[PDB]
């Protein structure tokens, strides 16, 4: 077959939920992605090599004359000269500073990588930053695919677009693809007619909640959140409001501080 494009997947300050979301890929599935579509050349969660052998695999991939795409999960801890996060006894800040400027393209995958995420919430003891913020001085401009975790549809769609067109798709002012992030959750929500009618559930136990009334009074952040959740859904089957729970705003910068308390509007 043809040479497959190389992907280097990095883990910074992360929970591995973004990695797990990629494993949920559907049509194409993850086996197709790593056997046919791409060459996954470094990924600490699933790779065979460990230790020195893993470091050597990383160096081999990064220095390849064929080039690579970087996918980055997690925020970069910057406090105290980066010491709150290390891999192979190098700071995550140093690792990303050395690798990411060499990539042909960088995708920041998940709200942590895009915007700083959960560890960047106040008081941000580790000085965590999103990729573009941390590395702006190096000229890194990662495509931001936000969410906690994002819809893996949005990662695969971005990669496929880039491979076909050799360019990023149209990006919004937060560097997110407009093809996925161009609409609010709310404008796509099945409960919108109740919102318009002023029909709000007053509590989770209420008959109004049972009947599917709008969750705005219970804190829903759909009106202020850009994502494709109601359209694509998750796991081919559901999404938060259809499970009766408000959106918490998880594709937005700083959402941990901007969208809290989660149960108020």
């Amino acid at each position: 077959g043809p040479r497959r494009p190389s992907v280097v997947y990095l883990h910074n300050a992360e929970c591995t939920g973004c990695s797990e979301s990629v494993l949920r890929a559907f049509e194409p599935y993850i086996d197709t992605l790593i056997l046919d579509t791409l060459s996954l050349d470094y990924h600490e969660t699933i790779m065979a090599a460990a230790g020195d052998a893993a470091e050597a695999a990383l160096e081999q991939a990064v220095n390849s004359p064929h080039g690579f795409i970087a996918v980055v999960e997690g925020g970069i801890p910057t406090a105290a000269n980066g010491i709150y996060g290390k891999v192979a006894n190098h700071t995550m800040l140093d690792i990303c500073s050395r690798i990411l400027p060499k990539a042909q393209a960088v995708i920041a995958y998940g709200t942590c990588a895009t915007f700083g995420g959960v560890q960047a919430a106040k008081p941000n003891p580790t000085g965590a930053k999103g990729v573009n913020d941390a590395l702006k001085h190096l000229g890194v401009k990662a495509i931001n695919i936000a969410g906690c975790p994002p819809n893996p549809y949005n990662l695969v769609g971005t990669i496929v677009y880039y491979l076909k067109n050799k360019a990023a798709p149209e990006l919004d002012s937060l560097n997110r693809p407009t093809m996925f992030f161009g609409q609010t959750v709310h404008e796509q929500c099945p409960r919108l007619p109740h919102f318009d009618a002023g029909e709000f559930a007053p509590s989770f136990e209420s008959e109004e909640a049972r009947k599917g009334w709008c969750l705005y009074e219970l804190g829903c952040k759909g009106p202020v959140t850009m994502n494709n959740c109601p359209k694509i859904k998750f796991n081919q089957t559901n999404w938060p409001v259809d499970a009766g729970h408000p959106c918490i705003g998880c594709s937005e910068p700083d959402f941990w501080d901007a969208m809290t308390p989660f149960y108020q509007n």
Partner: protein, 533 residues
């Protein structure tokens, strides 16, 4: 044979950022250190916030053991406010947790652990007809030569591209003296690794049916759950179909593979043992009584399973003397402190971002081996039946369980038992709905001052979240997580943690490719984002 240090950093095929250091003498490990190398500080971040918000933050402790921390935080706040959630909320929460166990353990065995035992490249040498006969002898599912040739053909194309991807620099490339499987068994395992990549999609989808999405579910609230659609016959049938398929894979694919690998690696009954075990129980009938759980809590010291001790939550203290936090004072988590202070590797004898939890001063293994051994010893009939059948198939005695192999087997045992029990819970839930109980959430009031604790036995063991509410806000919030118990460092009595102690005695055939260290470390299923938070 090798004498000197070995460092494995990164330890791959775990969740999170782990550095293992060992001292080897004449080919065997004589000392070990478990160094967790990322800190986030979620407990610091939580201070001052609304207690209702905690579960949303703490779920992001870990996306491998997704849901578990949302459940622990919700149990914790439920407990603090004194709400008794409706029966259906317990059922739905329990069903989603059961589904999490199945997903997590399947992915662990195949996608995290198996590359320590399976030489994928050797599958290219296999005779697919012989392999199919072996596969069909160990499982009621029949596999043909053509089925396995399709895998071998796909693998051949991949390897002949020269782009080995996740297999680059694998310890098995070119052969390795510690890799024992024949080509045919390697092909069977590789085929099932690939199958499991697609099966786990279904296993995770089962959580989303009631729980909105996976990863990071969104259906729990203080007082119960939000998912009225989960009461419908259509959602229940969707869950049931996914569960049935997942259970079939457990029973027909995972367990037979686990047994065929264990039989080939029976020497691994000799390495990786531990002394003490703690477990919290799981799948309650009564949210306020741990002894109402399908698996019950318990504590065992020095392998004395005739004398299971009751679990006293006041006997937990988390040490910091060998951790990157201020001072040396251990704390009970209702008086916990999270005060980072980095000193670099071994600076002032500190080497990890994990705290070191101790129970009555002792280091405790938690996770599947603890849950299975304690339940067995409590007379749990399902755990006894499966465990005895596994020991008989392997031709080993109960002593074999105290090992790396045993721990790996216990993860399978747990998976099989829980897969069956999910069906029982599902039927009980259906029966409850049929009686006319359609309630899923109960009202509650926020106290200005309260203490609460929530207990979950997660896939890696006993998880507890601890809150002190002051002025209706989070005064203190402390997570004590299973991997903290198992993989945290030494305490102020200098006692090795379970993973550290278990590594003493490990043989290392090739110090450049120290797969034996990985086998033992991976058998605990480390989760470092969990352990540190």
């Amino acid at each position: 044979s090798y004498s000197g240090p070995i460092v494995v950093d990164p330890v791959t095929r775990i969740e999170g950022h782990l550095r293992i250091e060992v001292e080897v003498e004449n080919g065997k490990v004589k000392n070990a250190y478990s160094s967790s190398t990322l800190f986030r500080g979620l407990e610091i971040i939580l201070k001052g916030r609304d207690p209702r918000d905690a579960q949303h933050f703490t779920q992001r402790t870990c996306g491998v053991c997704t849901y578990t921390h949302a459940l622990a935080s919700t149990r914790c706040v439920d407990n603090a406010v004194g709400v008794h959630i409706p029966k259906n909320a317990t059922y739905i929460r329990n069903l989603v947790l059961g589904a999490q166990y199945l997903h997590d353990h399947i992915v662990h065995f195949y996608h995290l652990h198996a590359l320590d035992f399976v030489d994928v490249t050797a599958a290219l040498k296999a005779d697919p007809a012989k392999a199919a006969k072996v596969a069909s002898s160990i499982s009621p599912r029949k596999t043909t030569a053509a089925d396995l040739k399709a895998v071998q053909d796909k693998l051949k194309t991949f390897v002949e591209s020269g782009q080995l991807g996740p297999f680059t620099n694998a310890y098995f490339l070119g052969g390795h003296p510690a890799y024992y499987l024949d080509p045919e068994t390697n092909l069977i395992a590789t085929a099932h690794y690939l199958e499991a990549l697609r099966l786990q999609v279904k296993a995770a989808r089962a959580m989303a049916v009631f729980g909105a999405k996976n990863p990071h579910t969104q259906f729990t609230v203080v007082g119960g759950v939000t998912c009225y659609d989960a009461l419908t016959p259509q959602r229940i049938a969707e869950f049931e179909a996914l569960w049935k398929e997942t259970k079939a894979f457990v029973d027909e694919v995972y367990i037979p593979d686990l047994l065929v690998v264990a039989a080939a690696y029976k020497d691994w009954t000799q390495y990786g043992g531990t002394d003490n075990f703690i477990t919290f129980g799981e799948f309650p009938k009564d949210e306020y009584d741990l002894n109402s759980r399908f698996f019950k809590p318990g504590v065992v010291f020095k392998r004395d399973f005739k004398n299971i001790k009751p679990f006293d939550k006041m006997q937990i203290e988390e040490h910091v003397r060998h951790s990157w936090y201020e001072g040396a004072e251990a704390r009970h988590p209702w008086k916990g402190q999270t005060q980072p202070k980095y000193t670099d590797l071994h600076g002032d004898d500190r080497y990890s971002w994990m705290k070191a939890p101790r129970y009555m001063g002792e280091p405790m293994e938690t996770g599947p081996l603890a849950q299975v051994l304690i339940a067995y010893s409590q007379g749990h009939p399902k755990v006894k039946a499966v465990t005895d059948a596994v020991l008989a198939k392997l031709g080993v005695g109960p002593e074999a369980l105290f090992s790396t192999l045993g721990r790996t087997a216990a993860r399978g045992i747990e998976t099989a038992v829980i897969a069956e029990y999910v069906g029982v819970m599902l039927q009980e839930y259906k029966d409850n709905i049929a009686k006319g109980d359609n309630v899923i959430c109960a009202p509650w009031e926020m106290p200005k001052q309260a203490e609460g604790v929530g207990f979950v036995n997660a896939p890696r063991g006993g998880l507890s979240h601890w809150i002190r509410i002051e002025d209706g806000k989070i005064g203190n919030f402390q997570l004590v997580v299973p991997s903290t118990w198992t993989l945290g460092p030494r305490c102020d009595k200098n006692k090795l943690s379970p993973v550290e102690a278990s590594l003493i005695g490990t043989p290392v055939a090739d110090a450049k490719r120290p797969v034996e260290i990985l086998r033992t470390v991976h058998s605990f299923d480390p989760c470092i984002a969990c352990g540190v938070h």
